[PDB]
Amino acid sequence: CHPRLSLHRPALEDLLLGSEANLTCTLTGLRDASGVTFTWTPSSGKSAVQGPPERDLCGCYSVSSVLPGCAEPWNHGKTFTCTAAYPESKTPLTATLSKSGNTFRPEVHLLPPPSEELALNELVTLTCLARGFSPKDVLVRWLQGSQELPREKYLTWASRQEPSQGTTTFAVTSILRVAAEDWKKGDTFSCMVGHEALPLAFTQKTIDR
Amino acid sequence: ESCHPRLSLHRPALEDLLLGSEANLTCTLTGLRDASGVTFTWTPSSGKSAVQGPPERDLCGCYSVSSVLPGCAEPWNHGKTFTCTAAYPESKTPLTATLSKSGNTFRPEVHLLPPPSEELALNELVTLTCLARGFSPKDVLVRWLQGSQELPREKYLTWASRQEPSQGTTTFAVTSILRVAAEDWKKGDTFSCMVGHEALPLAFTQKTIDR
Amino acid sequence: YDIKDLHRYYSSESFEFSNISGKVENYNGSNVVRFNQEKQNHQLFLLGEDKAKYKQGLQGQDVFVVKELIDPNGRLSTVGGVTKKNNQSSETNIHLLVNKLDGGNLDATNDSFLINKEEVSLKELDFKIRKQLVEKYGLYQGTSKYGKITIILNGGKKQEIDLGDKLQFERMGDVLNSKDINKIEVTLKQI
Amino acid sequence: LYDIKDLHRYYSSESFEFSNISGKVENYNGSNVVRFNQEKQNHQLFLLGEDKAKYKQGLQGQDVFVVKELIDPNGRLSTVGGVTKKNNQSSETNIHLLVNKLDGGNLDATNDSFLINKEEVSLKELDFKIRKQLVEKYGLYQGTSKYGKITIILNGGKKQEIDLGDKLQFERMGDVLNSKDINKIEVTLKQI
Numbered sequence: 001c002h003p004r005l006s007l008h009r010p011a012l013e014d015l016l017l018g019s020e021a022n023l024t025c026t027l028t029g030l031r032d033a034s035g036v037t038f039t040w041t042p043s044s045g046k047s048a049v050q051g052p053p054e055r056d057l058c059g060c061y062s063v064s065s066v067l068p069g070c071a072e073p074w075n076h077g078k079t080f081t082c083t084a085a086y087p088e089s090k091t092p093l094t095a096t097l098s099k100s101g102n103t104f105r106p107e108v109h110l111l112p113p114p115s116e117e118l119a120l121n122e123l124v125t126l127t128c129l130a131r132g133f134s135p136k137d138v139l140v141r142w143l144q145g146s147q148e149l150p151r152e153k154y155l156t157w158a159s160r161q162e163p164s165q166g167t168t169t170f171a172v173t174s175i176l177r178v179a180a181e182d183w184k185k186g187d188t189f190s191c192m193v194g195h196e197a198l199p200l201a202f203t204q205k206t207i208d209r
Numbered sequence: 210e211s212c213h214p215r216l217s218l219h220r221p222a223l224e225d226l227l228l229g230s231e232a233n234l235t236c237t238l239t240g241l242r243d244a245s246g247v248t249f250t251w252t253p254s255s256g257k258s259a260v261q262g263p264p265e266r267d268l269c270g271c272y273s274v275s276s277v278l279p280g281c282a283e284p285w286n287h288g289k290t291f292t293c294t295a296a297y298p299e300s301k302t303p304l305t306a307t308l309s310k311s312g313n314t315f316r317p318e319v320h321l322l323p324p325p326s327e328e329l330a331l332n333e334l335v336t337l338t339c340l341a342r343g344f345s346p347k348d349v350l351v352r353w354l355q356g357s358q359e360l361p362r363e364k365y366l367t368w369a370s371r372q373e374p375s376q377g378t379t380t381f382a383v384t385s386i387l388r389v390a391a392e393d394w395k396k397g398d399t400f401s402c403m404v405g406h407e408a409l410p411l412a413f414t415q416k417t418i419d420r
Numbered sequence: 421y422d423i424k425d426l427h428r429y430y431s432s433e434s435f436e437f438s439n440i441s442g443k444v445e446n447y448n449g450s451n452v453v454r455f456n457q458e459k460q461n462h463q464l465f466l467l468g469e470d471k472a473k474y475k476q477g478l479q480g481q482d483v484f485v486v487k488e489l490i491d492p493n494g495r496l497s498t499v500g501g502v503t504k505k506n507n508q509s510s511e512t513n514i515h516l517l518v519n520k521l522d523g524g525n526l527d528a529t530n531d532s533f534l535i536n537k538e539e540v541s542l543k544e545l546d547f548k549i550r551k552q553l554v555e556k557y558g559l560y561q562g563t564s565k566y567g568k569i570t571i572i573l574n575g576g577k578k579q580e581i582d583l584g585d586k587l588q589f590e591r592m593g594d595v596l597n598s599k600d601i602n603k604i605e606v607t608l609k610q611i
Numbered sequence: 612l613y614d615i616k617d618l619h620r621y622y623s624s625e626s627f628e629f630s631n632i633s634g635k636v637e638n639y640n641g642s643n644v645v646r647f648n649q650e651k652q653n654h655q656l657f658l659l660g661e662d663k664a665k666y667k668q669g670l671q672g673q674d675v676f677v678v679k680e681l682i683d684p685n686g687r688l689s690t691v692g693g694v695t696k697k698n699n700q701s702s703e704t705n706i707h708l709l710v711n712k713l714d715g716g717n718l719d720a721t722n723d724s725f726l727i728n729k730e731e732v733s734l735k736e737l738d739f740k741i742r743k744q745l746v747e748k749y750g751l752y753q754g755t756s757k758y759g760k761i762t763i764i765l766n767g768g769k770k771q772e773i774d775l776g777d778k779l780q781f782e783r784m785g786d787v788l789n790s791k792d793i794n795k796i797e798v799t800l801k802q803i
């Protein structure tokens with residue numbers, strides 16, 4: 001066992017597709033049970049929680065605190081402070097994070113299928129590459145013309161950091177295998193990347209025959 | 210809960226197998242704790258004995274010992290099967306692990322892809338994408354070349370070997386990204402994406418591109 | 421901005437809603453008004469003059485939507501295009517001269533352009549003119565891409581839209597008013 | 612259709628004819644190879660098929676016609692098949708090489724010849740050498756000349772055909788012929 005505090009930025013999915021974009025501060029490693037002082041600072045809906053989750057993923061549970069409403073304060077970029085007070089030891093625990101600065105947008109690219117696949121004329125592969133964006137965090141989705149294809153139907157790698165002797169940037173690729181017909185048929189496909197640094201938070205690159 | 214034990218036997222590093230001389234097999238544990246003398250027993254006990262390691266401890270406690278079987282590289286490629294059994298003072302009942310070189314494989318479908326129709330109309334750095342798809346186990350190697358020159362690991366990005374979405378046979382795919390100088394790309398030279406896999410006839414494959 | 425994407429875009433259907441109202445949320449850090457109209461929800465981004473001009477959301481204005489794209493949540497995002505209410509106090513047909521320049525020759529084609537309201541959105545003004553430049557002058561098609569829409573106001577001053585790439589969102593908020601427009605000239609420099 | 616550039620690169624790259632090569636066969640990723648040094652280069656000769664049992668105990672000192680497949684991160688030049696007896700001296704003999712271009716509804720054909728250095732040659736050496744000629748003197752694998760079929764004549768005793776559609780099958784680069792048993796060679800380019 002061993003208690004540690006932790007702060008988590010609001011998920012991009014939520015930041016770009018949810019209403020109640022809430023933030024989470026969480027204390028783990030407690031042997032105790034509760035009675036923990038979860039006091040932040042930006043009082044604009046402040047309403048922690050606990051519901052003691054034995055799911056400390058370890059032989060000794062813990063609890064957490066939420067700050068609903070803070071969907072906008074986050075985009076502005078204020079330094080949130082979640083001070084945690086628990087039994088065991090005195091001097092409480094305090095971790096605090098804010099928005100990330102020094103950001104760049106994704107340079108999306110929708111690559112056509114490999115000549116060789118058009119030959120085997122079976123299933124052509126559409127590759128999507130987003131690169132050069134900062135906040136590692138990014139979303140990627142697909143469309144057949146105007147209809148978003150289910151995630152269950154494509155593969156998206158993990159946003160990794162690229163090689164550069166300076167501006168720290170990340171890159172993400174994704175593969176969508178489509179029916180040979182449909183590609184030659186004519187209907188288009190699109191790659192839709194989401195991001196904080198984008199203007200409308202989403203770019204959409206489209207390619208066809 | 211807490212530290213529930215898990216024994217796992219690992220295959221030799223594809224890398225070692227293809228480019229190395231001594232390839233080993235690792236048999237380790239997870240939940241188990243305590244006992245620094247509690248050893249495991251391997252099957253092909255051809256003299257070469259295992260080599261336990263530094264207890265090492267996962268967070269939240271739960272220690273984890275490993276046992277590497279040296280040069281067991283010939284037998285691997287030779288189709289033999291290994292068996293690792295660990296005994297601890299946790300359960301009077303031991304754990305057994307068994308592994309052998311995969312049958313029913315699939316050669317990587319390697320595709321070298323040209324720079325974005327736009328990335329070049331900025332004459333800065335063009336982006337070369339390599340995609341290996343539909344292959345046997347998920348163990349693959351990806352390398353980059355400028356003609357006959359192998360560029361360094363630091364000079365590129367290859368993502369993990371993920372599993373391809375499928376309804377039938379199970380295959381994986383991996384992607385790599387080499388950013389080159391538009392200047393070089395433009396002056397006509399070439400680039401290669403060499404891949405490593407155990408299903409590929411010659412162990413490797415090279416797919417080459419250029420304008 | 422590669423031909424196919426410009427033809428694509430400058431071809432899409434544009435809507436001209438009326439008497440719209442909204443609050444404004446800080447989506448991804450930018451002020452945007454949301455509103456449903458023809459069974460389709462929109463998400464108007466206020467990124468230019470309109471950002472301050474409409475710092476209090478929308479309460480009765482008209483809006484020119486043009487699909488930048490549709491959020492994976494089903495919300496068509498459009499940029500600017502907001503013009504005051506009680507604005508249909510006139511029509512207006514202004515002179516539109518189009519000049520397709522090729523082998524160094526001319527090919528002038530004095531045409532005409534219509535303005536739906538009194539106060540205009542550089543967005544609408546630009547969007548339509550290009551739509552009309554494609555449908556009748558093969559723009560962003562084959563090879564006609566570069567150009568330069570020029571709007572000429574009474575007095576003398578004149579505004580310019582480069583055809584090279586979509587109008588900047590920064591200026592979709594901009595508003596002109598019919599009456600101060602003498603003539604419009606284009607130059608489909610098909611290089 | 613597309614691998615046109617690839618086929619070219621290969622069937623026109625620099626070949627190599629070595630001799631008195633000795634090497635203990637080793638195991639590699641489940642294959643039967645023989646590594647060996649020759650002229651600043653390190654080779655890795657893979658043995659697949661007819662040649663894998665013939666040389667169960669490596670290469671005593673035969674002759675090897677090496678063709679570079681690629682060069683792994685370790686500098687080894689992966690090559691396949693192409694070994695010959697050893698008691699291989701020399702038989703510079705010229706075989707008749709008929710090349711029939713079929714472009715259009717026409718057949719603008721021509722008569723040529725084919726040289727052979729060894730007494731015992733390898734289908735590997737034939738296929739390579741031949742196509743190279745078909746490449747240099749008939750622009751094979753260029754523009755649209757990709758498909759066709761090389762037909763060898765085993766002195767009124769058989770007929771060995773090598774499709775030009777793609778590379779020779781590794782399986783085949785282990786078969787050998789007797790330079791003498793050849794009568795004539797007929798190529799049939801199929802420019803579509």
Ligand SMILES: *[C@@H]1O[C@H](CO)[C@@H](O[C@@H]2O[C@H](CO)[C@@H](O)[C@H](O)[C@H]2NC(C)=O)[C@H](O)[C@H]1NC(C)=O
Pocket residue numbers: 014020021022066067068
């Ligand atoms: C964002 O945070 C809110 C609040 O912490 C979550 O919404 C709660 O959902 C439960 C569901 O039963 C309701 O009972 C509460 O009233 C909601 N809270 C409030 C005050 O809105 C919401 O789930 C979080 N969003 C996610 C899923 O990330």
Ligand SMILES: *[C@@H]1O[C@H](CO)[C@@H](O[C@@H]2O[C@H](CO)[C@@H](O)[C@H](O)[C@H]2NC(C)=O)[C@H](O)[C@H]1NC(C)=O
Pocket residue numbers: 222225231232233234260277278279280
């Ligand atoms: C067993 O194989 C592993 C995998 O190749 C070896 O671990 C590597 O050791 C090198 C240094 O010698 C490191 O650079 C790699 O990062 C290691 N890889 C791993 C496993 O993380 C290991 O040395 C081998 N041990 C024996 C007994 O041969």
Ligand SMILES: [Ca+2]
Pocket residue numbers: 421422423
């Ligand atoms: Ca163009």
